[PDB]
Design an enzyme around this catalytic site. Sequence first.
Site, PDB file in Angstrom:
ATOM      1  N   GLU A 141      50.808  41.984  36.831  1.00 51.68           N
ATOM      2  CA  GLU A 141      49.683  41.645  37.696  1.00 51.68           C
ATOM      3  C   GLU A 141      48.855  40.542  37.070  1.00 51.68           C
ATOM      4  O   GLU A 141      48.436  39.648  37.775  1.00 51.68           O
ATOM      5  CB  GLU A 141      48.835  42.892  37.936  1.00 51.68           C
ATOM      6  CG  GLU A 141      49.503  43.891  38.874  1.00 51.68           C
ATOM      7  CD  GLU A 141      49.586  43.511  40.351  1.00 51.68           C
ATOM      8  OE1 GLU A 141      48.962  42.493  40.742  1.00 51.68           O
ATOM      9  OE2 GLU A 141      50.332  44.204  41.075  1.00 51.68           O
ATOM     10  N   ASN A 154      43.802  36.010  48.063  1.00 54.55           N
ATOM     11  CA  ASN A 154      44.802  36.412  49.062  1.00 54.55           C
ATOM     12  C   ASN A 154      44.621  35.590  50.333  1.00 54.55           C
ATOM     13  O   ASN A 154      43.555  35.045  50.542  1.00 54.55           O
ATOM     14  CB  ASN A 154      44.714  37.899  49.394  1.00 54.55           C
ATOM     15  CG  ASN A 154      44.855  38.730  48.144  1.00 54.55           C
ATOM     16  OD1 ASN A 154      45.741  38.441  47.359  1.00 54.55           O
ATOM     17  ND2 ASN A 154      43.965  39.670  47.877  1.00 54.55           N
ATOM     18  N   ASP A 190      44.106  36.414  53.364  1.00 58.57           N
ATOM     19  CA  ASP A 190      43.070  36.929  54.244  1.00 58.57           C
ATOM     20  C   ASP A 190      41.663  36.672  53.707  1.00 58.57           C
ATOM     21  O   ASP A 190      40.707  37.182  54.275  1.00 58.57           O
ATOM     22  CB  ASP A 190      43.222  38.423  54.444  1.00 58.57           C
ATOM     23  CG  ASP A 190      42.918  39.265  53.218  1.00 58.57           C
ATOM     24  OD1 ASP A 190      42.843  38.672  52.116  1.00 58.57           O
ATOM     25  OD2 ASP A 190      42.732  40.482  53.391  1.00 58.57           O
ATOM     26  N   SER A 242      40.384  37.747  50.826  1.00 55.04           N
ATOM     27  CA  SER A 242      40.051  38.661  49.761  1.00 55.04           C
ATOM     28  C   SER A 242      40.528  38.085  48.426  1.00 55.04           C
ATOM     29  O   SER A 242      41.308  37.137  48.394  1.00 55.04           O
ATOM     30  CB  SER A 242      40.638  40.028  50.029  1.00 55.04           C
ATOM     31  OG  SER A 242      42.055  39.965  50.096  1.00 55.04           O
ATOM     32  N   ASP A 288      41.770  39.264  44.290  1.00 54.06           N
ATOM     33  CA  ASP A 288      42.165  40.277  43.324  1.00 54.06           C
ATOM     34  C   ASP A 288      41.598  39.940  41.938  1.00 54.06           C
ATOM     35  O   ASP A 288      41.619  38.808  41.497  1.00 54.06           O
ATOM     36  CB  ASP A 288      43.674  40.337  43.224  1.00 54.06           C
ATOM     37  CG  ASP A 288      44.414  40.714  44.495  1.00 54.06           C
ATOM     38  OD1 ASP A 288      43.819  41.276  45.421  1.00 54.06           O
ATOM     39  OD2 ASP A 288      45.615  40.534  44.505  1.00 54.06           O
ATOM     40  N   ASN A 312      41.644  44.622  44.550  1.00 52.06           N
ATOM     41  CA  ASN A 312      41.453  43.771  45.727  1.00 52.06           C
ATOM     42  C   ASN A 312      40.101  44.025  46.409  1.00 52.06           C
ATOM     43  O   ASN A 312      39.840  45.139  46.878  1.00 52.06           O
ATOM     44  CB  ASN A 312      42.545  44.055  46.747  1.00 52.06           C
ATOM     45  CG  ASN A 312      42.597  43.028  47.852  1.00 52.06           C
ATOM     46  OD1 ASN A 312      41.652  42.254  48.036  1.00 52.06           O
ATOM     47  ND2 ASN A 312      43.674  43.036  48.622  1.00 52.06           N
ATOM     48  N   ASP A 370      44.834  57.738  46.145  1.00 56.11           N
ATOM     49  CA  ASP A 370      44.465  57.642  47.543  1.00 56.11           C
ATOM     50  C   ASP A 370      45.650  57.987  48.449  1.00 56.11           C
ATOM     51  O   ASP A 370      45.506  57.931  49.661  1.00 56.11           O
ATOM     52  CB  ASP A 370      43.933  56.270  47.888  1.00 56.11           C
ATOM     53  CG  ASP A 370      44.980  55.174  47.998  1.00 56.11           C
ATOM     54  OD1 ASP A 370      46.217  55.464  47.863  1.00 56.11           O
ATOM     55  OD2 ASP A 370      44.545  54.017  48.169  1.00 56.11           O
TER      56      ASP A 370
END
EC number: 3.2.1.17
Length: 129
Positions: free
Chosen positions: A35, A46, A48, A50, A52, A59, A101
Amino acid sequence: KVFGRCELAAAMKRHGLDNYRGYSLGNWVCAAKFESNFNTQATNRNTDGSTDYGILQINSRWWCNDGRTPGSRNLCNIPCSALLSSDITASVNCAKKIVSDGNGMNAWVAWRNRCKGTDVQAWIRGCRL
Ligand SMILES: [Cl-]
Ligand SMILES: [Cl-]
């Protein structure tokens, strides 16, 4: 800070990630490597809008507030900048919420694509933990 492999393994162990939700330490080291290349200051944007952040590329769409991801959530209740610290506490605490989650470590694309089903114990081989 750019961590060494063993240094990071030891820091993650101290912060309760070893076997957390059944994920052995090698999984977490492997994810961090792919990562962020073990760099706490990594950021990536990203498509969209967003971003990271940090060693585990958490994110802003869901997990942290960076003030420029309109309509996003802040489920870890932290500014995304806290994820860039040389102290990984905030990253680790937020990662525990993510992995809990329901999707496990599949949340991390690089984990799914580069670590899952590999010999992840190799990432902690030789380390004094
Ligand atoms: Cl925002
Ligand atoms: Cl799982």
